[PDB]
Coordinates of C-alpha atoms and ligand atoms in Angstrom, one line a residue:
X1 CA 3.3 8.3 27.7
X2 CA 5.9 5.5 28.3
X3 CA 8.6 5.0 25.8
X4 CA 8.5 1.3 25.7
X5 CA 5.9 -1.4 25.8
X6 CA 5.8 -4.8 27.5
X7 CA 6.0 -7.4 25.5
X8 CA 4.4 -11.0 26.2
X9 CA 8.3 -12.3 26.8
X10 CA 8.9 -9.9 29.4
X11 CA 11.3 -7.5 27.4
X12 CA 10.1 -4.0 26.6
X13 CA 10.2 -2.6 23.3
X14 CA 10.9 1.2 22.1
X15 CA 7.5 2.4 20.8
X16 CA 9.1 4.6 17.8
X17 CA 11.3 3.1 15.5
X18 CA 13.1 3.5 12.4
X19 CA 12.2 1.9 9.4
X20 CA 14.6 1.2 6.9
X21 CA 12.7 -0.1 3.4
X22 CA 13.3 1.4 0.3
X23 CA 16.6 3.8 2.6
X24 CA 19.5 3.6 -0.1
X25 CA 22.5 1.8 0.6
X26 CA 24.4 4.3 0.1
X27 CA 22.4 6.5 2.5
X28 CA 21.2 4.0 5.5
X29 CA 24.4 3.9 7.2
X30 CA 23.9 7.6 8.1
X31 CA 20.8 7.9 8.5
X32 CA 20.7 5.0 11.6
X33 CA 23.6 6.8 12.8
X34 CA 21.6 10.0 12.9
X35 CA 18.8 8.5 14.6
X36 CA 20.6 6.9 17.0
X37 CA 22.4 10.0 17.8
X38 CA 18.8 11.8 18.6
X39 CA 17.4 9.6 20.3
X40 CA 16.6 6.5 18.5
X41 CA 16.8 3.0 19.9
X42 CA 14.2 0.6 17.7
X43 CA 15.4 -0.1 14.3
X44 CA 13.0 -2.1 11.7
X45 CA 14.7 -4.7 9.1
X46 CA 14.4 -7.0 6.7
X47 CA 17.4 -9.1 4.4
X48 CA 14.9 -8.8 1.3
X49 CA 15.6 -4.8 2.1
X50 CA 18.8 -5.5 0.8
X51 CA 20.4 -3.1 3.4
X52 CA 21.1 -4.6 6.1
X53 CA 24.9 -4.9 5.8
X54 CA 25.0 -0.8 5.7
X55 CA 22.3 -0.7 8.3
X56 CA 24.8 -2.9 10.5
X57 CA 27.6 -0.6 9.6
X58 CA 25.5 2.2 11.5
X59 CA 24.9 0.0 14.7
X60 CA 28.4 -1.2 14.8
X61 CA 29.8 2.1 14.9
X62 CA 27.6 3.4 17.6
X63 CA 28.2 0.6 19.9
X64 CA 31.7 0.8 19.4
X65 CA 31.8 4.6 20.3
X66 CA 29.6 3.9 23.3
X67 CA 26.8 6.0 22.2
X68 CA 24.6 3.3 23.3
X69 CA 24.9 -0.2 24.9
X70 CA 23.6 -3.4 22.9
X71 CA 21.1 -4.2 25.3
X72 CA 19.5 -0.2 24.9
X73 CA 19.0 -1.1 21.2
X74 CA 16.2 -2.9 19.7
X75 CA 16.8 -4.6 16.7
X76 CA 14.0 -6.2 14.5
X77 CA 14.5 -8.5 11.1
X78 CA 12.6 -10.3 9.0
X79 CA 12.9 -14.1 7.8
X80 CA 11.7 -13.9 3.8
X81 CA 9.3 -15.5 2.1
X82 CA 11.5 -18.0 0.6
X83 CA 13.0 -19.4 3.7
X84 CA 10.2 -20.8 5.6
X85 CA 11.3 -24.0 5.3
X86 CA 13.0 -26.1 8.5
X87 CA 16.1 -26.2 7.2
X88 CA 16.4 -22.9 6.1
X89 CA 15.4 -20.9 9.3
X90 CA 18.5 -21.1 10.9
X91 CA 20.8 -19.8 8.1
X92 CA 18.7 -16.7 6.9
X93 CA 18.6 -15.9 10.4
X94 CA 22.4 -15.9 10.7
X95 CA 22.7 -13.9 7.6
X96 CA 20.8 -11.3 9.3
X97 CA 22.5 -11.4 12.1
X98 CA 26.2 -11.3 10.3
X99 CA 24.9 -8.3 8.0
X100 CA 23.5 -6.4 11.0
X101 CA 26.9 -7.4 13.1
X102 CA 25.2 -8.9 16.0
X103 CA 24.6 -12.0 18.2
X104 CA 21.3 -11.9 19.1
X105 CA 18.0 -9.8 17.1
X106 CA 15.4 -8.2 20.0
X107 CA 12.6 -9.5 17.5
X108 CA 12.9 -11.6 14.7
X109 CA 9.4 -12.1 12.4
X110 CA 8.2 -13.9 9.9
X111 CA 8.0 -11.5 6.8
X112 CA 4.3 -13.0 5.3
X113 CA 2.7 -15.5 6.1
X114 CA 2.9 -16.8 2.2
X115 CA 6.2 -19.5 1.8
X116 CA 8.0 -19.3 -1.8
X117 CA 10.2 -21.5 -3.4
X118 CA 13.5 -21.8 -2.3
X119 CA 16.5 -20.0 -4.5
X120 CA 18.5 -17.0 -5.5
X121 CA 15.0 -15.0 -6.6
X122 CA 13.0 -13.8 -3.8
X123 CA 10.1 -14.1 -5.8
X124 CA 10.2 -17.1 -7.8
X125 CA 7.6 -16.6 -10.8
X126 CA 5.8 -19.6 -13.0
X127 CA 6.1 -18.2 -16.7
X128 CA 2.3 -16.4 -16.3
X129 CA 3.8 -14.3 -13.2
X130 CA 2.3 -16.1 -10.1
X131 CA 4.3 -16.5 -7.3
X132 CA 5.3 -20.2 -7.0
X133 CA 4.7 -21.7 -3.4
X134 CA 6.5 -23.6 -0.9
X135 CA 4.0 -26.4 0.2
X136 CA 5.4 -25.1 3.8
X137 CA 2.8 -24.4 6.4
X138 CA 2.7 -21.3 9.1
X139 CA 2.2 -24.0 11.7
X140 CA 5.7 -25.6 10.8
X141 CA 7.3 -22.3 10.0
X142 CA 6.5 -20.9 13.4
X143 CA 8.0 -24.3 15.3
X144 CA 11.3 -23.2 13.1
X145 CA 11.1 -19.7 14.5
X146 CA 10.3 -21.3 18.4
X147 CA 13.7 -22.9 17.9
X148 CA 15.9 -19.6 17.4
X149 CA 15.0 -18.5 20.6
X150 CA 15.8 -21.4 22.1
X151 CA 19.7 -21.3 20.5
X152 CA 19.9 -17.9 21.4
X153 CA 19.8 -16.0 18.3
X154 CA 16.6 -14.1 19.0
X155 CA 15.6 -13.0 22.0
X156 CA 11.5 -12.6 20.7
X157 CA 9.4 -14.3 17.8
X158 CA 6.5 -12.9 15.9
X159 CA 4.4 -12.3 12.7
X160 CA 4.1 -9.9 10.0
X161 CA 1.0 -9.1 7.9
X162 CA -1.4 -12.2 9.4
X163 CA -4.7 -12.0 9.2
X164 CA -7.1 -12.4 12.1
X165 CA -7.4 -16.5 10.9
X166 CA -3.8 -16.6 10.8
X167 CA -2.9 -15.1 13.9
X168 CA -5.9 -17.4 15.3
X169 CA -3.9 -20.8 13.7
X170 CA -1.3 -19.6 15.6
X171 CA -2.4 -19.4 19.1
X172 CA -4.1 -22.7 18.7
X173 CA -0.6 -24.3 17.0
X174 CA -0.4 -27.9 18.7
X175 CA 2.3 -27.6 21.1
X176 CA 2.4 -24.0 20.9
X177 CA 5.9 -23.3 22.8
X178 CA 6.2 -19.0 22.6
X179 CA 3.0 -17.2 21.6
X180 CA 4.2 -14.3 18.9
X181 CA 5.0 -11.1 20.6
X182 CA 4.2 -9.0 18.3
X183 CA 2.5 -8.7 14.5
X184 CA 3.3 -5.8 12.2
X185 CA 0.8 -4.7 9.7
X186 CA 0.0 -1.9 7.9
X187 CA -1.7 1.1 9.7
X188 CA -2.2 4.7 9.4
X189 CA -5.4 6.5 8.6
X190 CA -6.7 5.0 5.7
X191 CA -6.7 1.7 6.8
X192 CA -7.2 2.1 10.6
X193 CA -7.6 -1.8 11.3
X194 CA -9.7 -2.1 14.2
X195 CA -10.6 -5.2 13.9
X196 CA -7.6 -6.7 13.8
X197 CA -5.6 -4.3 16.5
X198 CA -8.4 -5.6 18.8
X199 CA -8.0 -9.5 18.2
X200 CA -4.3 -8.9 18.7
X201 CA -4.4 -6.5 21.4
X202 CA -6.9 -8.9 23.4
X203 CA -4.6 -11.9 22.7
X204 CA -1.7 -9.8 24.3
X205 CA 0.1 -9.7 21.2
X206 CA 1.6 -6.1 20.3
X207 CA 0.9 -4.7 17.2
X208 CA 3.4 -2.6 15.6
X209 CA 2.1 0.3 12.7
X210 CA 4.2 0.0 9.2
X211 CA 3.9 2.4 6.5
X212 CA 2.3 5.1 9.1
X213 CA 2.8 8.0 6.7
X214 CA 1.3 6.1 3.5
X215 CA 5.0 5.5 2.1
X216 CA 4.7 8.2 -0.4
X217 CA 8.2 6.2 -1.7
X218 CA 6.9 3.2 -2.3
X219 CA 7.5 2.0 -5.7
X220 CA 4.3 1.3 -7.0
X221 CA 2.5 4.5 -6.3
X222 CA 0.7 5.7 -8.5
X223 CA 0.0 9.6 -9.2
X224 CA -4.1 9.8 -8.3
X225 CA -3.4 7.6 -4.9
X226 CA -4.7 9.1 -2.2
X227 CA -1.9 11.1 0.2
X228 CA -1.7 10.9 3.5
X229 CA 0.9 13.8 4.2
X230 CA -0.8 16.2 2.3
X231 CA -4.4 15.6 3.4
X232 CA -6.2 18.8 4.5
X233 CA -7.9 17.3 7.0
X234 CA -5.0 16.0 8.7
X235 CA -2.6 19.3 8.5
X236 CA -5.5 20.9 10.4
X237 CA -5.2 18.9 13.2
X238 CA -1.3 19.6 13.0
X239 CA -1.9 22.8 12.8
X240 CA -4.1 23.0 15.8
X241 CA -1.4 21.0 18.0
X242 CA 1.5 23.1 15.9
X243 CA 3.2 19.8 15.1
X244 CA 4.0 18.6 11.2
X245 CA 1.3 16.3 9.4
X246 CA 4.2 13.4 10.1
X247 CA 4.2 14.1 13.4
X248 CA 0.5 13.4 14.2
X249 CA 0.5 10.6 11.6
X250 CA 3.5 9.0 14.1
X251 CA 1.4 10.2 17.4
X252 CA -1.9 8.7 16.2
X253 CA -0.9 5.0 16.7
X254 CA 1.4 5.6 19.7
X255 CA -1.9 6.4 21.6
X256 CA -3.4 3.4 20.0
X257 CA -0.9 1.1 22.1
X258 CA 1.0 0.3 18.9
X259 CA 4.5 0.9 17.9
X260 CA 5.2 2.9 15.0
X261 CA 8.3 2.5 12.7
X262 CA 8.5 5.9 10.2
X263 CA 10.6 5.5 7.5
X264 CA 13.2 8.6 6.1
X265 CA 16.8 9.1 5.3
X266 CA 16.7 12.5 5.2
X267 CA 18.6 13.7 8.5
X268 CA 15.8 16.5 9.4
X269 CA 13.1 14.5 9.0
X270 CA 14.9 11.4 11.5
X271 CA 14.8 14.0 14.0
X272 CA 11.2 15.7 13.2
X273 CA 9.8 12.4 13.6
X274 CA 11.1 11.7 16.7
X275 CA 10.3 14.7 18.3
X276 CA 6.3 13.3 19.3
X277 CA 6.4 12.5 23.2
X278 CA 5.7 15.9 24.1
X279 CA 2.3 16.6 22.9
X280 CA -1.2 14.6 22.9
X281 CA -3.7 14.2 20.6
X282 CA -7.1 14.4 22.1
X283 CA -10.0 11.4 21.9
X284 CA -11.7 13.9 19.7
X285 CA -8.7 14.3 17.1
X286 CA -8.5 10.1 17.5
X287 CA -11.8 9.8 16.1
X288 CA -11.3 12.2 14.2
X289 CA -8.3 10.6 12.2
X290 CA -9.8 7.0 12.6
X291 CA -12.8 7.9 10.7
X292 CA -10.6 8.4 7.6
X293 CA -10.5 4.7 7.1
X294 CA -10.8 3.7 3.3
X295 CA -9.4 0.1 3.3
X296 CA -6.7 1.4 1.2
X297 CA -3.6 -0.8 1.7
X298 CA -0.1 0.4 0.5
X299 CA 1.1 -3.1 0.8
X300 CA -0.9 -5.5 -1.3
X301 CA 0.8 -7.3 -4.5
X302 CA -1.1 -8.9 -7.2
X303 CA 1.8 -11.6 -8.1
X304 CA 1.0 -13.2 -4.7
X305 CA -2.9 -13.1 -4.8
X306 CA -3.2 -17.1 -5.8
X307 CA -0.9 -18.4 -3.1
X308 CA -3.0 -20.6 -0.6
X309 CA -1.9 -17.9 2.3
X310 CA -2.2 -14.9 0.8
X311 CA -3.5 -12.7 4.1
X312 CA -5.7 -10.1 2.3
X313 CA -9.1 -12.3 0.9
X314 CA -10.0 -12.5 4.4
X315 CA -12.0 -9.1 5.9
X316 CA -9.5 -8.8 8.4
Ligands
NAP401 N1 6.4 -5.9 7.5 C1 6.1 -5.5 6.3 O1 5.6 -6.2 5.4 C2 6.4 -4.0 6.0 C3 5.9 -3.4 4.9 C4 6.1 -2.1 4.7 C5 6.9 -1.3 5.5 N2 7.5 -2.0 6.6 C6 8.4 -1.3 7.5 O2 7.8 0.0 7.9 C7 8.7 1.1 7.5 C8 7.9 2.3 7.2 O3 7.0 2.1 6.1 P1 7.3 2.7 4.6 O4 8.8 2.8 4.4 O5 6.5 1.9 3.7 O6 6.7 4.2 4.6 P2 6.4 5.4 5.6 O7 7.3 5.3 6.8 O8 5.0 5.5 5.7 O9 6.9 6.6 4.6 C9 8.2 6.8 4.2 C10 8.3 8.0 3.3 O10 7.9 9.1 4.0 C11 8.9 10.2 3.8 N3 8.9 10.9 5.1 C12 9.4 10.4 6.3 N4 9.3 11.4 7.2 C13 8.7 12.4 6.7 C14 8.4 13.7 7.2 N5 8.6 14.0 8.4 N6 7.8 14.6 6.3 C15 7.6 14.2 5.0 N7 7.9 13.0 4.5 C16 8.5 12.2 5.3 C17 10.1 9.4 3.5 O11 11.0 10.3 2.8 P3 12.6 10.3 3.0 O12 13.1 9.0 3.4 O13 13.1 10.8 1.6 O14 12.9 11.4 4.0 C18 9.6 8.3 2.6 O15 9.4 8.7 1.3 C19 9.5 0.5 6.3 O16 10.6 1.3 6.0 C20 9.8 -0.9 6.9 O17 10.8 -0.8 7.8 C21 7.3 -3.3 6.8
1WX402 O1 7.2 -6.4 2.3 C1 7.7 -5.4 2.8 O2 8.3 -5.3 3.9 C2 7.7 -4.1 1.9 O3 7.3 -4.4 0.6 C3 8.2 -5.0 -0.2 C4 9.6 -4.8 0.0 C5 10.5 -5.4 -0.9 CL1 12.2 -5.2 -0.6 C6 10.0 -6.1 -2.0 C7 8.7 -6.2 -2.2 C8 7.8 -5.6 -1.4 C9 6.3 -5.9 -1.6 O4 5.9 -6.1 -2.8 N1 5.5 -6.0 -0.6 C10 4.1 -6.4 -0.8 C11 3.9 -8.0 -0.6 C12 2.7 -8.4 -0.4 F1 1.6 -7.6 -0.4 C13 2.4 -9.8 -0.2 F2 1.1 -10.2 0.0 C14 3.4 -10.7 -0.2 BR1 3.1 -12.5 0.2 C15 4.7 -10.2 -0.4 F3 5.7 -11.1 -0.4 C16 5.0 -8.9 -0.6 F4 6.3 -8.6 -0.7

């Protein structure tokens, strides 16, 4: 299997990447360097990460020892919830780009579909906890994103965490200048998201596979959750293949014509997880792993339930 995919603006896109959420500051910097040494060339961002200065560090230093060429990377931020408004696009976009040291992201998307109000908080609560809103649409927010491409400053557009009716309002946006390239969601076995991965797929949109081991780290875990990496069912089918649970959890979307963008900063694990172009599951073990869907979503958060776009009341 190819290493990239073809994106609906003609540039390709690394199928594995490295996802940085949650990676420490103190820690990032390394770990992107380590991935790019083995093999690396897709790294996943966001300024609400909080990272990205230290992530930047790590591509800088790379480039400049001439481990890799800017154009072989592919670098992919996120525009937060409280930006969505026109005059804000432009300057979070640029912070972004001076934290991550470059001219130009590969991919640029917008975060969620919900728009918060402007300020230093990047969740701006009323005094009952509720997310406030921006009264921004996704309509206008996506004619904002349509003009960083055309200045330069990203080379691709796209969405992250739209539902079918959003990705829909989209496509049919009046005036419509760049179709998004690509919307990440959630995906791994428990919430397999066929429906949605079809609409997408069908529209030619690429659909890239966050949280593909169940982010054990994410904050909010609780201890009875159900656990992904330590599922019996899916160690036997690494077993059978003699490849780690992580490994077939990364595998299983690559075959589904997704990208996939594992998160670690621990320096064995980078290079475990990269090591999954040499093996195939079968359309049995596919199956197999897709028929552990329980709509159990990793990323979900209650604070935001009220807001007019919230992207999880709808089935898919
Ligand atoms: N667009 C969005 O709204 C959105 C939402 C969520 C995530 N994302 C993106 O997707 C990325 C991945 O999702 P995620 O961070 O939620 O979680 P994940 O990649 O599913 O899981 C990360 C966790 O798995 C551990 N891990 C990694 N490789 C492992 C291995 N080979 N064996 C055992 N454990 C392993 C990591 O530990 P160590 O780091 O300690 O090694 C970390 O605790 C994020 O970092 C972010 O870039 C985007
Ligand atoms: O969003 C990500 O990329 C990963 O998750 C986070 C990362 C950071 Cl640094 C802070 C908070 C989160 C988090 O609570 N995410 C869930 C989450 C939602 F479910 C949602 F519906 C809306 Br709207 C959100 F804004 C939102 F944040």
């Amino acid at each position: 299997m190819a290493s990239r995919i073809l994106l609906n603006n003609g540039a390709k896109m690394p199928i594995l990447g490295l996802g940085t959420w949650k990676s420490p500051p103190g820690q990032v910097t390394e770990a992107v360097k380590v991935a790019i040494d083995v093999g690396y060339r897709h790294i996943d961002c966001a300024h609400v990460y909080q990272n990205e200065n230290e992530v930047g560090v790590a591509i800088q230093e790379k480039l400049r020892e001439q481990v890799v060429k800017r154009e072989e990377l592919f670098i992919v931020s996120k525009l937060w919830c409280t930006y969505h408004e026109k005059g804000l696009v432009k300057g979070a976009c640029q912070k972004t780009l001076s934290d991550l040291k470059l001219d130009y992201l590969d991919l640029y998307l917008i975060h969620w579909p919900t728009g918060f109000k402007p300020g230093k908080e990047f969740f701006p609560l009323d005094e009952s906890g509720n997310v406030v809103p921006s009264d921004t649409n996704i309509l206008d927010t996506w004619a904002a994103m349509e003009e960083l491409v055309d200045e330069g400053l990203v080379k691709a557009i796209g969405i992250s965490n739209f539902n079918h009716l959003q990705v829909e309002m989209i496509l049919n946006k009046p005036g419509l200048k760049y179709k998004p390239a690509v919307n990440q969601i959630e995906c791994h076995p428990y919430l397999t998201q066929e429906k949605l991965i079809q609409y997408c797929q069908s529209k030619g949109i690429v659909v890239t596979a966050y949280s593909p081991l169940g982010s054990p780290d994410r904050p909010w875990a609780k201890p009875e959750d159900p656990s992904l990496l330590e599922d019996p069912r899916i160690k036997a089918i690494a077993a059978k293949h003699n490849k780690t649970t992580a490994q077939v959890l990364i595998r299983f979307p690559m075959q589904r014509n997704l990208v996939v963008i594992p998160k670690s900063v621990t320096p064995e694990r980078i290079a475990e997880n990269f090591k999954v172009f040499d093996f195939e599951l079968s359309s049995q073990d596919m199956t197999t792993l897709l028929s552990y869907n329980r709509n159990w979503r990793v990323c979900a958060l209650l604070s935001c339930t009220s807001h007019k776009d919230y992207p999880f009341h709808e089935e898919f």
